[PDB]
Structure 1
Amino acid sequence: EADLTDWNLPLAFMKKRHCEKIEGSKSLAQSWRMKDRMKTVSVALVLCLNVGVDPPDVVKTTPCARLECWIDPLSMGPQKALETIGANLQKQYENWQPRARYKQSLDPTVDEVKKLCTSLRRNAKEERVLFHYNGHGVPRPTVNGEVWVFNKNYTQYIPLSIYDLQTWMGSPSIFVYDCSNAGLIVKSFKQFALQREQELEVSMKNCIQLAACEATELLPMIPDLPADLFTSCLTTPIKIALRWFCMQKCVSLVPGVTLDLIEKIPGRLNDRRTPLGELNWIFTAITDTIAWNVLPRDLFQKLFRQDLLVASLFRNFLLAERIMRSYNCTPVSSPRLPPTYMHAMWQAWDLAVDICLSQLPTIIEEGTAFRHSPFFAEQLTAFQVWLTMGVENRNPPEQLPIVLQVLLSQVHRLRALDLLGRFLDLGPWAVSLALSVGIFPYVLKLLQSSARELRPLLVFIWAKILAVDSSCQADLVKDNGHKYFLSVLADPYMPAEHRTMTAFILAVIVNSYHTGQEACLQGNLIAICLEQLNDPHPLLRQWVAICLGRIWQNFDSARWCGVRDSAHEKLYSLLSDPIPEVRCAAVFALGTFVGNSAERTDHSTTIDHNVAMMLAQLVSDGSPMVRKELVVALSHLVVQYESNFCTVALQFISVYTQIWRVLLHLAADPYPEVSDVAMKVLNSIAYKGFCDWSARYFAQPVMKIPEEHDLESQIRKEREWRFLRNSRVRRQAQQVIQKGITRLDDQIFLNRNPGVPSVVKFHPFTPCIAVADKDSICFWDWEKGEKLDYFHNGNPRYTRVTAMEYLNGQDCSLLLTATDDGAIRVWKNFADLEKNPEMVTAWQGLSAGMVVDWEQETGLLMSSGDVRIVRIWDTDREMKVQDIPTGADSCVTSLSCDSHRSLIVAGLGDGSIRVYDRRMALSECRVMTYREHTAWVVKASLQKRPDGHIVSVSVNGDVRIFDPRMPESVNVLQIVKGLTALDIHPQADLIACGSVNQFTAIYNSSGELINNIKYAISCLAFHPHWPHLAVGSNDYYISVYSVE
């Protein structure tokens, strides 16, 4: 089952390639941080009507458009009713905003106009004035933008002073022109504004304008219309829409409806549960949706998000565009809008009305409890579909402005909040899109609700926002909402993920600035954070320790609880942590605990000294990141220990010097960045971050599905074709042994390679024979018989590259190199000369003789040398974790750590052979000792086998074979008595002898011999399956031997 064996075969440093790639970003528009709040001043209501006096331009007919604000003056008290309409119109505007004033201005002459406009403008200059007009009992506007009222005499022509109004309205304002040629007023306003420019050459028009028709047009006279139609739309859209609707079609698919019933829809145009609330509420959603769809991006916020009475009547403008184009009108706007009348969302409106008014012919009479509209259910479903494929970031989904209404609506909030969660869990565009749509104020407000439902919802959403967003600035902590988080930091009633997010959110609140460290005192965050050290989830333990380490920022009043309730000592339980990310997170927090203590000394010197000695312990790690974070926790102590360090530094030319001793340990490290990190921190004293990795994760999508179950997933397709290949290789490479051994009748190659015999390794299925210079990783090709290249291991030339291993064999051909001084270094990408290699990790493992045994077999690395011990290395702790001694005192010179009998052999520096049951107590490891060697053990092949026999050679000059259950050397080959190179390969059962002659000597485990062939040599090895030989030889050279 080869591709299952290939993945079952473990691999090394898999996560370690991820972390250092700490992400950065730049600030958006993020204009949900919206500034400008010029509201309205007041409404001018220059209600020029001269009631009953026909402007002589017009001739009426009996079927006449007559109503205004749904009052008829012809059937009312004439000169009295002229007041009533002004109050009525104000009261309609008060529905759209009452927090601004009103003057009801009836047939005003220029003096009256001057008084009205200038007095109101004088009360507030930068604020928006509302110019509002009606052109009745008043002829059509002049070519030069003028009017027709004086002392209500006879529709008397008057210049409107419009070019003076142009500075009265020069600062922000809005204008409405209800008249028979309003586009002429707008055009001429441009000619006067251009005359203002033709002075300003020594705010051209920011101010808003709404025109009841274009210049060429003239108003309708159909009696079924309210006469003030443009205003009636801008003021009462629902009455218009319903009263338009009911006339339009030419077969009434619901037939019961009449004008009479649409007057009597129940509700009060301000209650969503009532039908008369529902149609408005739907209309409110539709208009935004078109706006987001069809406008260029900024213009939407500029008109529909900056200000209320700007936006609100603007929504009605689209409804006006529809009815007006039904008739012969084309109303027009200050800004240069694109058209809208056609858009598909209008048909969603018309269906929603038909559904509603199907019922009303009974509800009016039969006490029918009405059926609520399905509009929102239908809408969220469509969005849910686009998420459920979720297949892109292209043409982003237009339902987005509908979502905002359900974030408020309790009746349906849950579903919407989840869907929004999934959307926010997508990549940063979706976050940016929600933010710039103006999701923020809802997501700000709604944490007012301590409903447990917000834990998987608004809290998760907050987490993902903050994962990218630095601009949220403990806002809900200077506001009330934070009380939510203070529960779900510690609240156990859900999985630790929910605490992980909250620990991150509170770790963000302390990341932001001192507002979080104040919030620590406003809720005792230290104590409840320490309670979370105990939960099993490692990334919670990380976020808890990064929380406390940010709590101990320069806000020393927080460190008072960290001292006075023993946080720093209690936290040492996460120095007893196997997880190097959690270990680092605690190491960081103790770093800032001492470091940021406002240069406080005295009793803190004694206590923080214990923190320093406790930190000094964790030098144990092959981990590059613990090796950095240890030195960085010490540079954090130095944040106030630089107040003492100058004299302490001189002692190597107590506890300050234990920090110094640890810094002096890491400054030599074979990973250049770890030697650098310690070197630069020693040097800065001599002259006198990880949390961003935690942040760099949290943006990643969670709901999106891991790959390997998909047959089209490329990781799987590479594995499945390329590694399954090795069934045939693992057979074929051993088939000459299966078929029985034959003469060594051929050679692939004899020539130079740039490496010394201090290391030789054969790569099993792929061509790199590694033979390396004493400072090197260097290579030649066994498949084709060809030069590959030299590269540098980086160890200094008084040391020696002494061993090599591969952290698989076939797939990810990661390689380890080891050095006589110990130096362990791990390497990639040279493996098929694709590109330039790099070092994935290195550490000074083993700090006479050095030896290595990597187990692909089990997922463990082992090595021995001057430490008088076989180190056993674990990549899960990233540490030396188990330790087997020399037994005698002469350090090990050849070894095998078997895991098929589970044994060690240590061929020693005194030439004795130690055999170990590695289950025995570590002071007692000897199962056997042998002493038929007494100089130095050059070869110690304890075969990792069911017949786990020992072949061994020593500087005494002899070969012998030994059995681990016998106190003796049992049998003999000695084909040459003893010699400068030998191998005994455990899957070929062959031996090769480093003949001093020009022909290499070759023999068998049976004591039999085979044909000797051309090249004293210092190293050789057989292939891991093939009965073929690589000879790393002597004098920067290789020769290779086979059957043919």
Structure 2
Amino acid sequence: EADLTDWNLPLAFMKKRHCEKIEGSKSLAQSWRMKDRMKTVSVALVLCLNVGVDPPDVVKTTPCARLECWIDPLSMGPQKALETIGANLQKQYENWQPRARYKQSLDPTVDEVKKLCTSLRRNAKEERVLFHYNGHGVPRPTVNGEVWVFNKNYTQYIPLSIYDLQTWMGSPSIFVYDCSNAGLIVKSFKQFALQREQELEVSMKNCIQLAACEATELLPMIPDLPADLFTSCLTTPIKIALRWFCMQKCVSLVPGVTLDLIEKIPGRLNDRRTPLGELNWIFTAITDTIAWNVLPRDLFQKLFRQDLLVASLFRNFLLAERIMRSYNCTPVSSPRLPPTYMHAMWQAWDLAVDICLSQLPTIIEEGTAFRHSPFFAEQLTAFQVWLTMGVENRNPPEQLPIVLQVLLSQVHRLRALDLLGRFLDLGPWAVSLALSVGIFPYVLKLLQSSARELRPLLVFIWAKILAVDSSCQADLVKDNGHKYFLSVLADPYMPAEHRTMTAFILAVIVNSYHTGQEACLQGNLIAICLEQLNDPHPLLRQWVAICLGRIWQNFDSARWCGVRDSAHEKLYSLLSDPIPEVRCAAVFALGTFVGNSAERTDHSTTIDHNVAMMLAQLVSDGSPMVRKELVVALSHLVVQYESNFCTVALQFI
């Protein structure tokens, strides 16, 4: 048949340079950058425990709930117990924020609270200050916006107005109320907030508030649970999470798992290779995933990315909402969250816990080696399955924040870096998402690694990022990540495909940025580039030449290094290259080289005339794309000798 002749024919003038316009893509408004980083400088632990005394409003049951901060107060005697709970509570908070000035107040007066809050505001006027209030020992807050403390003698409950309490504390602050009708405080706090706004004409968004309960609701009296149910959730999530898991009906499915085995669970909360550190790591992933899927992007970056401690509190708040719901309790937040209790990911958390502490009989008694959870593996498997048919702009993958959490270890780091690159490839919309979830500071931290297996993956990931957001050139120079890539560009064994991406990354870092031009010049880029200038790959030859042109753009020091290496001579070879992309890139670099002469020694003028005549023999060229850059290149010649070209122009008139 006469079809093999048709299919086997070059379609002339049908390529990217012809069909598409030679125009730069308009950069979108990259809003991923965080506006500011908050720092919780100090913490106020106001504890109205009233150990050994029962509040008159609530008639406690005989068993009641005794545990406070995982300490039986009646075991230690009244006074010591109050000091001990304050010490433990500090430690618990120091798990999440170890670098903050703690100052306990134990059954305080009003003056005592005034001097305490005013001092912490003086220390950090412009920074967030945490106010923790535990009113289990005082009567319930009133409708009139008041909170109870004691008198000097501990003979009368003195009320304290929320207005005056929010007077002494400043604008950036966060309030945690762990009492029974805690909703009343939040209502009256917002009232006095509105009342201040009305007085201001002739501190609301800044003030965060967490509350254990709704104004109508009461705290649970159940002897199995600790009395400090809310604070424990916020400050020791894994501890109550396992105790609550052992209280549900789903324990029948795993016989031989009592609370006593949970007490003696091995490990720590830091070591992710231990059983306890595994759950804490999984929990951090699950909570950060629920938040990203449920909350609107704006409010997520406000609470879960700005500062660590707030993000940790809201992460653990989501667990409180779920647990307390099961006892006719609704926690309350000032920026109202939509109900997450019914999210699918919570079911995954149960299974993850189940598999992790089904091994505990064998780990404790038999001494079996703790096998790690398949959780992170299976979640990466789900993300991979999504990518298979992920071309369309459908709902984003739920597992994106888990991929971030996986990058923190080494066990699954290779697989995650692969998948993350494949995702970024899908399009610039996806790279925007991955930057909004907050991948940047972790991908940048991996540039401190020396594992050469990472080198092809990081080169890929960074090319996609810098293609979208070119402002990240600032960050890469600060952390000396440009050295990581310089090494990859001087490695003959690295494939030429990944070396091409590296030359682009460098051509972005250097682009119109004197700090990056001065930094790459000192890292000896021009010498490295010339070593790769004669490769058998037309994509590399093109970019290496653009990269060479950008480094000496209005930077005479990089030009002088080119003069010593005699780059302009080695670039004339690219002027006769088959591929018209390379020829054009070559004309670009030779033009930018000429443009920054800045009236140097006579040598420069003879070189500029040598570079001129070598360019002046690219007039009869087929591609107009090259001839266009040839003009811009000859523009640099006119700019340098504007006084001289006026002499020639006036002659022939």
Contact 2:243 2:259 survives alignment (8 Å): yes
Structure 1 or 2: more strand by fraction: 1
Pairwise CA distance, 1:35: 3.1
Query: Would you say 1:87 and 2:87 are equivalent positions?
Result: yes
Contact 2:190 2:204 survives alignment (8 Å): no
Query: Would you say 1:352 and 2:352 are equivalent positions?
Result: yes
- Secondary structure in 2 aligned to 1:29? coil
Pairwise CA distance, 1:252: 1.4
Pairwise CA distance, 1:640: 0.7
Contact 1:150 1:156 survives alignment (8 Å): yes
Pairwise CA distance, 1:435: 0.8
Q: Distance in 2 between matches of 1:203 and 1:151?
A: 30
Q: Which moved more, 1:420-429 or 1:623-632?
A: 623-632
Contact 1:474 1:512 survives alignment (8 Å): no
Contact 2:251 2:257 survives alignment (8 Å): no
Q: How has the CA–CA distance of structure 1 residues 29 and 133 changed in structure 2, closer, same or farther, with 3 Å as cutoff?
A: farther
- Secondary structure in 1 aligned to 2:373? coil
Q: Distance in 2 between matches of 1:147 and 1:644?
A: 85
- Secondary structure in 2 aligned to 1:193? helix
- Secondary structure in 2 aligned to 1:644? helix
Q: How has the CA–CA distance of structure 1 residues 121 and 516 changed in structure 2, closer, same or farther, with 3 Å as cutoff?
A: closer
RMSD: 1.8
Pairwise CA distance, 1:221: 1.1
Q: Deviations over 1:829-881 (max 9, x none)?
A: xxxxxxxxxxxxxxxxxxxxxxxxxxxxxxxxxxxxxxxxxxxxxxxxxxxxx
Q: How has the CA–CA distance of structure 1 residues 614 and 651 changed in structure 2, closer, same or farther, with 3 Å as cutoff?
A: farther
Q: Deviations over 1:600-658 (max 9, x none)?
A: 35222222211111211122223212222222221122231224211122454xxxxxx
Give the equivalent residue in structure 1 for 2:540.
540
Pairwise CA distance, 1:301: 0.5
Give the equivalent residue in structure 1 for 2:461.
461
Pairwise CA distance, 1:340: 0.6
- Secondary structure in 2 aligned to 1:214? coil
Q: How has the CA–CA distance of structure 1 residues 30 and 180 changed in structure 2, closer, same or farther, with 3 Å as cutoff?
A: same
Q: Distance in 2 between matches of 1:356 and 1:174?
A: 35
Q: How has the CA–CA distance of structure 1 residues 17 and 76 changed in structure 2, closer, same or farther, with 3 Å as cutoff?
A: closer
Q: Distance in 2 between matches of 1:364 and 1:514?
A: 61
Pairwise CA distance, 1:57: 1.5
Q: How has the CA–CA distance of structure 1 residues 397 and 597 changed in structure 2, closer, same or farther, with 3 Å as cutoff?
A: same
Q: How has the CA–CA distance of structure 1 residues 20 and 54 changed in structure 2, closer, same or farther, with 3 Å as cutoff?
A: closer
Q: How has the CA–CA distance of structure 1 residues 570 and 155 changed in structure 2, closer, same or farther, with 3 Å as cutoff?
A: same
Contact 2:418 2:457 survives alignment (8 Å): yes
- Secondary structure in 2 aligned to 1:222? coil
Pairwise CA distance, 1:346: 0.5
Give the equivalent residue in structure 1 for 2:312.
312
- Secondary structure in 2 aligned to 1:176? strand
Contact 2:488 2:494 survives alignment (8 Å): no
Give the equivalent residue in structure 1 for 2:602.
602
Gaps of 5+ in 2: none
Pairwise CA distance, 1:210: 1.0
Contact 1:43 1:130 survives alignment (8 Å): yes
Q: How has the CA–CA distance of structure 1 residues 364 and 530 changed in structure 2, closer, same or farther, with 3 Å as cutoff?
A: same
Q: Deviations over 1:978-1018 (max 9, x none)?
A: xxxxxxxxxxxxxxxxxxxxxxxxxxxxxxxxxxxxxxxxx
Pairwise CA distance, 1:408: 1.8
TM-score by length of 2: 0.96
Give the equivalent residue in structure 1 for 2:46.
46
Q: How has the CA–CA distance of structure 1 residues 143 and 637 changed in structure 2, closer, same or farther, with 3 Å as cutoff?
A: same
Pairwise CA distance, 1:176: 1.0
Contact 1:32 1:440 survives alignment (8 Å): no
Q: Deviations over 1:14-57 (max 9, x none)?
A: 22753761344555563442232231132221111222122111
Q: How has the CA–CA distance of structure 1 residues 43 and 475 changed in structure 2, closer, same or farther, with 3 Å as cutoff?
A: closer
Contact 1:130 1:174 survives alignment (8 Å): yes
Pairwise CA distance, 1:9: 4.0
Q: Distance in 2 between matches of 1:426 and 1:397?
A: 13
Structure 1 or 2: more helix by fraction: 2
Q: Distance in 2 between matches of 1:388 and 1:529?
A: 37
Q: How has the CA–CA distance of structure 1 residues 589 and 368 changed in structure 2, closer, same or farther, with 3 Å as cutoff?
A: same
Q: Which moved more, 1:514-523 or 1:362-371?
A: 514-523
Contact 2:45 2:132 survives alignment (8 Å): yes
Q: How has the CA–CA distance of structure 1 residues 65 and 616 changed in structure 2, closer, same or farther, with 3 Å as cutoff?
A: same
Q: Distance in 1 between matches of 2:565 and 2:19?
A: 34
Give the equivalent residue in structure 1 for 2:564.
564
Aligned residues: percent identity?
100
Q: Deviations over 1:883-924 (max 9, x none)?
A: xxxxxxxxxxxxxxxxxxxxxxxxxxxxxxxxxxxxxxxxxx
Pairwise CA distance, 1:437: 0.8
Q: Deviations over 1:699-747 (max 9, x none)?
A: xxxxxxxxxxxxxxxxxxxxxxxxxxxxxxxxxxxxxxxxxxxxxxxxx
Q: Deviations over 1:72-95 (max 9, x none)?
A: 122222222211111111111111
Contact 1:137 1:155 survives alignment (8 Å): no
Q: How has the CA–CA distance of structure 1 residues 18 and 442 changed in structure 2, closer, same or farther, with 3 Å as cutoff?
A: farther
Pairwise CA distance, 1:250: 6.4
The correspondence of residues 418-567 of structure 1 with structure 2, limited to 5 A, is: 418-567=418-567
- Secondary structure in 2 aligned to 1:105? strand
Contact 1:431 1:465 survives alignment (8 Å): yes
Q: Distance in 2 between matches of 1:251 and 1:284?
A: 23
Q: Which moved more, 1:138-147 or 1:291-300?
A: 138-147
Contact 1:146 1:159 survives alignment (8 Å): yes
Q: How has the CA–CA distance of structure 1 residues 25 and 587 changed in structure 2, closer, same or farther, with 3 Å as cutoff?
A: closer
The correspondence of residues 765-776 of structure 1 with structure 2, limited to 5 A, is: none
Pairwise CA distance, 1:251: 5.9
Contact 2:245 2:251 survives alignment (8 Å): no
Q: Distance in 2 between matches of 1:21 and 1:155?
A: 84
- Secondary structure in 2 aligned to 1:74? helix
* More RCO (CA 8 Å, sep 6+): 2
Contact 2:466 2:473 survives alignment (8 Å): no
Contact 2:32 2:432 survives alignment (8 Å): no
Pairwise CA distance, 1:488: 1.9
Q: Distance in 2 between matches of 1:316 and 1:499?
A: 44
Q: Deviations over 1:376-408 (max 9, x none)?
A: 111000000011222311111110000011212
Q: How has the CA–CA distance of structure 1 residues 68 and 274 changed in structure 2, closer, same or farther, with 3 Å as cutoff?
A: same
Q: Distance in 2 between matches of 1:578 and 1:99?
A: 62
Pairwise CA distance, 1:450: 3.3
Q: Deviations over 1:801-843 (max 9, x none)?
A: xxxxxxxxxxxxxxxxxxxxxxxxxxxxxxxxxxxxxxxxxxx
Q: Which moved more, 1:149-158 or 1:418-427?
A: 149-158
Pairwise CA distance, 1:166: 2.0
Gaps of 5+ in 1: 653-1044
Q: Distance in 2 between matches of 1:621 and 1:609?
A: 20
Q: How has the CA–CA distance of structure 1 residues 251 and 112 changed in structure 2, closer, same or farther, with 3 Å as cutoff?
A: closer
Give the equivalent residue in structure 2 for 1:271.
271
Contact 2:356 2:373 survives alignment (8 Å): yes
Q: Which moved more, 1:341-350 or 1:575-584?
A: 575-584
Q: How has the CA–CA distance of structure 1 residues 623 and 154 changed in structure 2, closer, same or farther, with 3 Å as cutoff?
A: closer
Pairwise CA distance, 1:352: 0.9
Q: How has the CA–CA distance of structure 1 residues 627 and 26 changed in structure 2, closer, same or farther, with 3 Å as cutoff?
A: closer
Pairwise CA distance, 1:469: 2.0
Contact 1:55 1:155 survives alignment (8 Å): no
Q: Distance in 1 between matches of 2:146 and 2:119?
A: 21
Contact 1:134 1:178 survives alignment (8 Å): yes
Contact 1:292 1:300 survives alignment (8 Å): yes
Pairwise CA distance, 1:151: 3.2
The correspondence of residues 1011-1030 of structure 1 with structure 2, limited to 5 A, is: none
Q: Distance in 2 between matches of 1:306 and 1:31?
A: 14
Q: Distance in 2 between matches of 1:366 and 1:248?
A: 27
- Secondary structure in 1 aligned to 2:52? coil
Q: How has the CA–CA distance of structure 1 residues 162 and 583 changed in structure 2, closer, same or farther, with 3 Å as cutoff?
A: same
Q: Distance in 2 between matches of 1:582 and 1:25?
A: 21
Pairwise CA distance, 1:230: 0.6
**Structure 1 runs (4+) greater than 6 angstroms displaced:** none
Pairwise CA distance, 1:12: 2.5
Q: How has the CA–CA distance of structure 1 residues 589 and 17 changed in structure 2, closer, same or farther, with 3 Å as cutoff?
A: closer
Q: Distance in 2 between matches of 1:7 and 1:578?
A: 24
Pairwise CA distance, 1:3: 3.5
The structure with the larger Rg is 1
- Secondary structure in 1 aligned to 2:130? strand
Contact 2:180 2:218 survives alignment (8 Å): yes
Contact 2:147 2:162 survives alignment (8 Å): no
Q: Deviations over 1:197-231 (max 9, x none)?
A: 23112123421111111011111111111001111
Q: How has the CA–CA distance of structure 1 residues 200 and 259 changed in structure 2, closer, same or farther, with 3 Å as cutoff?
A: same
Q: Distance in 2 between matches of 1:144 and 1:26?
A: 56
